[PDB]
């Protein structure tokens, strides 16, 4: 069972601690050349403290009897000779003997070894939670809890053992033995408290041998599990997530090139500065990136959590369902392009299945893979945009630069210290950034309702220095880049404009062969944009496309022989 | 500082170690302004050592806005590992020196001898604790020492030995 089993573990675990707790009580209450072995064997225990330990002993004795009947698989020698059974029979059977024999109530029984039986209950209790199989973070903390118990139970057995034998000569209290034990295990050796009796000498010899083997392996395994939770682990909590804002970044492998461009872009805006940026990444913390997250600014903000976006346990760490964004990014400079893009599609589907309400921002390399993540709110194909810049760089001089400076959010304070004329104005004009505000609401475009779009563009640039780009209507969702004189403005038309600073922030400006037009028939990918492109009347053959070998159509070997105008 | 970086949760900021060590040290000094008999009362101000270390880590990492500084990263990280060793000793010296006033009255230097002996696992027993609180402190100080200090030294040696192979600067 899951529920019915766990209660019996806690029942035995609590009873075994209660016997050790009652042992702490009787030591504090009961207190008193040749060695007086009377003080080792005879112990003036109280009747109520005795009677409770016997009732616990009978319960725990019957539990081991009952458990044998359940899991008896041929060999009883297999079960009796184990350590858990031997420690039971050392502790519990003497308490049963004291029921039948009346003079043996004062006789000593080493009940303190129930500490290890309580540890065996905890290991048995903890591993009932691994019926669900996958629980990576809970595995680390609960395993650490057992390593703490081994350290405590080794000390508890040492304290009790040495405190008991020292009754013979040089009578130590329970606390003096705890001081003595933790000193001897630490290998300090003050010699302020010492053993001076034949049995106690031999116990301390054994306790050092057990300590020097076990304890260093316990600490180094404890540190291994503790240090692994720093790199791998980290959970964005419910208390934090419900109250605060929260954003996720799914990625294969972070770098300084990728991260610093994102963090500077994201926290450049005023309203975004309160947000928290969680990371999801299968690979470990890099050496370079650890310095960036250590900085005071990004120490509070950014939370790097290891684990891929595909597994649903790693989504419960980040808690995407609460968060307001889920960035996915394709792995550039990977051995295979198609495999990297196929992974971002699976991440997109893994995110959408878990958290449907999150707006899915995604980046893909190849254009054919756009269709599969067209359901997502915002898509940026690298190949589509990349080659479009280069095409425009042939007609227009430097559109590559033009678009890069608009999308990168900056303000006019770059290269102002430099001595050159061009460089001051270049960095100022680089601060330009696209914005959007309605007509009636905007202080820029108040008295321009009856007038046209073109008329407003001149007077905006003349007075303020803020040129328009396009308009979005109320009904139409589409953006319309530069209407002519036909488009008249309205009360609520979203004007897109270019300015160094946004209007709402910027109060400082106010105070201070023939061809035929048609859509190309064969689109090489599914989700492609159809446009009119000056098509050929006849569909050309594949041979005539090649220059090098002149086929039976127009035999020209080189490109100069064609005689290209322009 | 709370007003500047308040992002929804105040429980997120109050329950941190840097804030708790502040309220343990600074708030009693504010209580002594209003109450006149409590000037002689003890306040454990020595824990400001760790608050000074938290200032140094916060100070040092302001220099990583330039991103790439590989040699400066190693030396300044070593400086923090030296502070942890000193501040652990300083807290130990002050703590044990304070409690031993009750019985067997040690000076500041005798506690420094006592502390660095106990952390090194030598255990002379020339100087010892013989009082109920001081016994319990030394039990805690050994547990903190035996976990932290070996990890501090081996990380210190890692950064020191890495500067030999990787590092080396031809000076001006």
């Amino acid at each position: 069972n899951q529920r019915s089993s766990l209660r019996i573990r806690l029942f035995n675990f609590s009873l075994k601690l209660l016997t050790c707790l009652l042992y702490i009580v009787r030591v504090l209450l009961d207190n008193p050349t040749k060695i007086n072995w009377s003080h080792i064997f005879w112990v003036d225990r109280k009747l109520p403290l005795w009677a409770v330990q016997v009732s616990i002993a009978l319960i725990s004795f019957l539990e081991t009897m009952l458990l044998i009947y359940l899991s008896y698989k041929g060999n009883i020698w297999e079960q009796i000779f184990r350590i858990s059974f031997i420690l039971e029979m050392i502790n519990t059977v003497p308490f049963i003997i004291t029921i039948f024999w009346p003079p043996l109530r004062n006789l000593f029984i080493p009940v303190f070894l129930n500490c290890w039986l309580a540890k065996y209950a905890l290991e048995n209790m903890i591993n009932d939670l691994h019926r669900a199989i996958q629980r990576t973070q809970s595995a680390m903390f609960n395993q650490v809890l057992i390593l703490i118990c081994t350290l405590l139970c080794l000390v508890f057995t040492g304290t009790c053992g040495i405190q008991h034998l020292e009754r013979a000569g040089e009578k130590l209290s329970l606390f003096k033995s705890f001081y003595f034990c933790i000193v001897t295990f630490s290998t300090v050796g003050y010699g302020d408290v010492t053993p001076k009796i034949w049995p106690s000498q031999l116990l301390v010899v054994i306790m050092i041998c057990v300590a020097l083997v076990v304890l260093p392996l316990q600490f180094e395994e404890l540190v291994y599990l503790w240090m692994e939770r720093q790199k791998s682990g980290g959970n964005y909590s419910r208390h934090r997530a419900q109250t605060e804002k929260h954003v996720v970044l799914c990625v294969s492998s972070l770098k300084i090139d990728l991260l610093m461009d994102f963090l500077n872009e994201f926290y450049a805006h005023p309203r975004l500065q309160d947000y928290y940026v969680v990371i999801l990444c299968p690979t470990e913390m890099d050496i370079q990136v650890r310095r960036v997250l250590q900085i005071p600014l990004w120490s509070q903000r950014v939370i790097y959590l290891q684990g891929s976006a595909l597994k649903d346990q790693d989504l419960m760490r980040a808690k995407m369902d609460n968060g307001e964004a889920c960035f996915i990014l394709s792995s550039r400079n990977e051995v295979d392009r198609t495999a990297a893009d196929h992974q971002t599609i699976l991440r997109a589907w893994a995110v959408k299945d878990f958290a449907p309400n999150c707006p899915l921002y995604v980046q893909i390399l190849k254009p054919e893979n756009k269709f599969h993540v067209k359901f997502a709110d915002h898509v940026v194909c690298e190949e589509e945009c990349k080659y479009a810049m280069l095409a425009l760089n042939c007609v227009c001089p430097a559109t590559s630069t033009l678009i890069t400076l608009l999308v990168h959010t900056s303000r006019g304070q770059e290269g102002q210290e430099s001595p050159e004329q061009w460089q001051r104005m270049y960095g100022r004009c680089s601060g330009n950034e696209v914005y959007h505000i309605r007509m009636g609401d905007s202080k820029f475009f108040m008295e321009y309702e009856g007038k046209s779009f073109t008329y407003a563009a001149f007077h905006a640039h003349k007075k303020y220095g803020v040129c328009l780009i396009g308009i979005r209507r109320e009904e139409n969702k589409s953006i319309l880049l530069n209407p002519g004189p036909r488009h008249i403005m309205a009360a609520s038309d979203t004007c897109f404009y270019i300015n160094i600073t946004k209007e709402e922030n910027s109060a400082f400006i106010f105070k201070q062969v023939e061809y035929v037009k048609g859509y190309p028939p064969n689109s090489p990918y599914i989700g492609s944009s159809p446009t009119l492109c000056h098509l050929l009347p006849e569909k050309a053959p594949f041979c005539c496309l090649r220059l090098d070998k002149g086929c039976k159509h127009n035999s020209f070997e080189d490109a100069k022989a064609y005689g290209f105008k322009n | 500082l709370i007003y500047l970086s308040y992002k929804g949760n105040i429980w997120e900021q109050i329950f941190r170690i840097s804030f708790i060590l502040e309220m343990i040290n600074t708030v009693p000094f504010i209580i002594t302004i209003f109450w006149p008999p409590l000037r002689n009362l003890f306040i454990p101000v020595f824990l400001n050592c760790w608050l000074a270390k938290y200032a140094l880590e916060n100070m040092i990492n302001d220099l990583h806005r330039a991103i790439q500084r590989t040699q400066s990263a190693m030396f300044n990280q070593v400086l923090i590992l030296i502070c942890t060793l000193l501040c652990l000793v300083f807290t130990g010296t002050c703590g044990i020196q304070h409690l031993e006033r009750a019985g067997e009255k040690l000076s500041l230097f005798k506690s420094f001898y006592f502390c660095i002996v106990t952390f090194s696992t030598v255990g002379y027993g020339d100087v010892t604790p013989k009082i109920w609180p001081s016994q319990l402190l030394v039990v805690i100080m050994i547990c903190v020492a035996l976990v932290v200090l070996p990890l501090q030294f081996e990380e210190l040696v890692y950064l020191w030995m890495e500067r030999q192979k990787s590092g080396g600067n031809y000076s001006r």
Partner: peptide, 18 residues
């Protein structure tokens, strides 16, 4: 930057943190 930069909070935030 009137809304973002010029405020009682951000004057102190630029001085301390940023």
């Amino acid at each position: 930057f009137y809304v973002n930069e010029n405020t009682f909070k951000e004057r102190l935030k630029l001085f301390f943190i940023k």
